[PDB]
């Protein structure tokens, strides 16, 4: 399995503190059946800046350690890009990373709102042949209060990625119920860990897949898992017709 959003790189954001932590997360991920992680450290204009070059280097150094430790996990470069107006431009100038240098870009909204220009930015990105993937939309306060915001973005071509832990219920029963609403409505195209540690923000990968199979049947979790395989090798993903979200 391919995990497309994860905070396993050390000394970069709220994720792994040092290499020991990174190794413990990798072991956790192996136990969940994950074999490849696209590292996506937080990248923002003030609080956390994590430059493409530094990400690539931390990922390569972590891989060397994992080969050393005989851990069968491979780490690839990416970023969790906090949305800003100039994403298309900076991407062209290689000042941002897409997920494994593919067409898919992981873009995060601020926690409490969806900036109005998102639709326009995402249209511009698509014209350049990029596909924006919305990070953890179930954790966005405004999408929570007004889930139609997500229906429209996805209909206009955006993909989104749900957090395994949200479906596993580790963030409350409320966040779980909302997450399932989003999946039913076909607004979700990937499941990923967003793992930060092995304590409170662990992977919950198998737990999430099991919840999906019980709620929807065996084909839907299989499709989501396969979307990650397609993303990694820069191929088109499977989409289902989006719909409005039930209360
Ligand atoms: Fe985030
Ligand atoms: Fe994240
Ligand atoms: Mg974080």
Residue 115 CB neighbours (<10 A)? 14
Between the CA of 158 and the centroid of ligand 3 the distance, in Å, is 21
Asked if the 1-247 domain carries CATH number 3.40.50.2300, the reply is no
Q: How far is the CA of 79 from the centre of ligand 2 (A)?
A: 9
Give me ligand 2 centre to Cα 169, in Å. Answer: 17
Are the beta carbons of 160 and 137 closer than 8 angstroms? yes
| Phi, psi at 162, each rounded to 5° | -90, 150
Distance CA 79, CA 224 (A): 20
Distance 42 CA to ligand 3 centre (A): 6
Check the CA dihedral 202-206-211-213 and report its sign.
Answer: positive
Phi, psi of 26 (to 5 degrees): -60, -45
- Per-residue burial over 170-179, b = 16 or more CB atoms within 10 Å of its CB, e = otherwise: bbeeebbebb
The tokens describing 11, both together, are: 């000394």
Q: How far is the CA of 200 from the centre of ligand 3 (A)?
A: 12
- Could you give the CA distance from residue 59 to residue 8 in angstroms, rounded to a whole number? 9
| Location of structure tokens 């900036």 | 115
Taking the centre of ligand 2 as the mean of its atom positions, its distance from the CA of residue 136, in whole angstroms, is 8
Ligand 2: centre distance to CA 214 (Å): 26
Question: In the chain, where are the structural domains located?
Answer: 1-247
Q: What is the dihedral sign for C-alpha 93, 46, 133, 207? A: positive
Task: Look up residue 204 and give its DSSP letter.
Answer: -
Dmax over CA atoms of the chain, in Å, equals 50
Specify the DSSP class assigned to residue 159: E
Contacting residues for 21 by C-beta, under 8 A, at least 6 apart: 10, 15, 197, 198
SS3 133: strand
Method used to determine the 3D structure: X-ray
Nearest ligand (C-alpha, residue 82): 1
Quote the tokens at residue 205: 């990968």
Burial 123-144 (b: 16+ CB within 10 A, else e): eebeeeebbbbbbbbbbbebbb
CB 212 within 8 A of CB 220: yes
Using CB atoms within 10 A of its CB, is residue 231 exposed (0-12), middle (13-18) or buried (19+)? Answer: buried
| 54-92: burial string, b at 16+ Cβ within 10 Å, e else | ebbebbeebbebbeeeeeebbbbbbbbbbbeeebbeebe
Stated in angstroms to one decimal place, the resolution of this structure is 1.8
Which residues, in sequence order, are bridge partners of residue 162? 191
The ligand whose atoms approach the alpha carbon of 196 most closely is 3
CA dist 183 and 159 (Å) reads 12
Q: What is the residue-wise DSSP string for 15-75?
A: S-SSHHHHHHHHHHHHHTT--EEE---EE-SSS----HHHHHHHHHHHHHHHHHTT---EE
Residue 29 Cα to ligand 2 midpoint, Å, equals 16
Q: How far is the centre of ligand 3, averaged over its atoms, from the C-alpha of 195 (Å)?
A: 8
């Amino acid at each position: 399995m391919i995990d497309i959003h994860c905070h396993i790189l050390p000394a970069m954001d709220d994720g792994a503190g040092d290499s020991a932590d990174s190794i413990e997360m990798a072991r956790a991920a192996v136990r969940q059946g994950i074999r490849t992680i696209i590292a996506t450290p937080h990248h923002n204009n003030g609080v956390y800046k994590n430059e493409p070059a530094a990400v690539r280097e931390a990922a390569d150094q972590l891989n060397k350690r994992l080969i050393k430790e005989d851990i069968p996990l491979h780490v690839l470069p990416g970023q969790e890009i906090r949305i800003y107006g100039e994403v298309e431009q900076d991407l062209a100038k290689r000042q941002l990373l897409s997920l494994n240098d593919t067409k898919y870009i992981l873009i995060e909204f601020p926690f409490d709102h969806v900036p109005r220009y998102a639709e326009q930015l995402f249209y511009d990105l698509q014209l350049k042949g990029y596909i924006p993937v919305i990070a953890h939309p179930e954790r966005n306060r405004e999408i929570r209060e007004n889930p139609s915001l997500l229906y429209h973005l996805v209909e206009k071509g955006a993909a989104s990625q749900i957090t395994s832990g949200s479906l596993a219920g580790i963030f409350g029963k409320q966040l779980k119920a909302f997450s399932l609403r989003l999946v039913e409505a076909n607004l979700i195209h990937f499941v990923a860990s967003d793992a930060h540690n092995v304590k409170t923000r662990n992977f919950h990968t198998q737990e999430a897949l099991y919840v999906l199979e019980k709620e929807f049947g065996s084909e839907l979790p299989y499709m989501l898992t396969e979307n990650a395989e397609l993303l990694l090798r820069n191929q088109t993903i499977f989409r289902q017709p989006p719909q409005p979200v039930k209360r």
